[PDB]
């Protein structure tokens, strides 16, 4: 499966994302309005991937058109990037099980974790700026890249492209906030702490939302949703939790408390305190 | 030294009342009473914890730990 994400306009960009979601996921019965839903990634065998061709960095122009992302389908992780001009797939070290036919695969020493990427990039995601201009710069940095080890500029490029492709696929909130940067005003998208927290809690959210049945709220660690419009405005695509990211510990996805659906592990993590006087004096 | 950074794979309440966590394949114990519910909360929510100690071999003790959301 090959898809284009076209950055030409907010319309082309959101259309591209929506088409991908439609093809790879199925709406949750209870979190769906029209064709706008929280969707569960359809099961594929491990190692299944789809390709994303990056288009439209220069609005409606057939240039800057040699970057492809390889995305593991079950988890939406970017496994690496393809320079289609050189026919070279630069693959992160945690995706040696992803085989792409027809390309030269460069297995890199660098793993795809945000911790590693942010270190190599010297760039924290919280406060990271993305604009059309810096996506063109990212494109150029990835096309110039060669070798088995991520450089600083190639890592910054991957941070930006992953945010605006895979993370936006997962999170309507990121799609909505970033797409402003594609308008003729060309403002800057700044990733917020909240955006980052959303990405970090994707597996936990995925384990909780399939249990939602119209409760007045949803609480998953630091994440709060207060109505269905908050859910839909924030989340678009979740893992199929019925992946190792679905479960932390225990076997109880949710507890309903006072008409709010809680991740059970969150409640357990603040209901495990002993008597405060005894705690504080038992030093 | 920053001995280990990762999720708590298991925790154990020991006979001597210390508390052991497994992080990044290595076991560390602490006698700090304040840390016992904190560590379990980190395990329950899959926090990334950083064990800091003067020795990092498995079976080392620690009294310093960072709880991260990333």
């Amino acid at each position: 499966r090959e898809f284009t994400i076209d950055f030409s306009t907010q319309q082309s960009y959101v259309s591209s994302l929506n088409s991908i979601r439609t093809e790879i996921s199925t709406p949750l019965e209870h979190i769906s309005q029209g064709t706008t839903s929280v969707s569960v990634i359809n099961h594929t065998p491990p190692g299944s991937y789809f390709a994303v061709d990056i288009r439209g960095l220069d609005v409606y122009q057939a240039r800057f058109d040699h970057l492809r992302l390889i995305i593991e389908q079950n988890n939406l992780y970017v496994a690496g990037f393809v320079n289609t001009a050189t026919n070279t797939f630069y693959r992160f070290s945690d995706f040696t099980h992803i085989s792409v036919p027809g390309v030269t695969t460069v297995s890199m020493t660098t793993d795809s974790s945000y911790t590693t990427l942010q270190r190599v990039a010297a760039l924290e995601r919280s406060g990271m700026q993305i604009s059309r201009h810096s996506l063109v710069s990212s494109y150029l940095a990835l096309m110039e890249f060669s070798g088995n080890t991520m450089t600083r500029d190639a890592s910054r490029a991957v941070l930006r492209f992953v945010t605006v492709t895979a993370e936006a696929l997962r999170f309507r909130q990121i799609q909505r906030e970033f797409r402003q940067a594609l308008s003729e005003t060309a403002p800057v998208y700044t990733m917020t702490p909240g955006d980052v927290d959303l990405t970090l809690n994707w597996g936990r959210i995925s384990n909780v939302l399939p249990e939602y049945r119209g409760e007045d709220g949803v609480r998953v660690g630091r994440i709060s949703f207060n109505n269905i419009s908050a859910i839909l405005g924030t989340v678009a695509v979740i893992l199929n939790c019925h992946q190792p990211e679905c479960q932390i510990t225990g076997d109880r996805p949710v507890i309903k408390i006072n008409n709010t659906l809680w991740e059970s592990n969150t409640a357990a993590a603040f209901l495990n305190r002993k008597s405060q006087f005894l705690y504080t004096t038992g030093k | 030294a920053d001995c280990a950074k990762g999720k708590i794979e298991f925790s154990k309440y020991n006979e001597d009342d210390t508390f052991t966590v497994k992080v990044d394949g290595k076991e560390y114990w602490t006698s700090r009473w304040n840390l016992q519910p904190l560590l379990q909360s980190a395990q329950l929510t899959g926090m990334t914890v950083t064990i800091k100690s003067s020795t990092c071999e498995s079976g080392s003790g620690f009294a310093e730990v960072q709880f991260n959301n990333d």
């Binding site: 992780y77 970017v78 795809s112 945000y114 991957v158 992953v162 990405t199 970090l200 | -």
Partner: peptide, 4 residues
């Protein structure tokens, strides 16, 4: 931690 979280993979990209």
């Amino acid at each position: 931690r979280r993979r990209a």
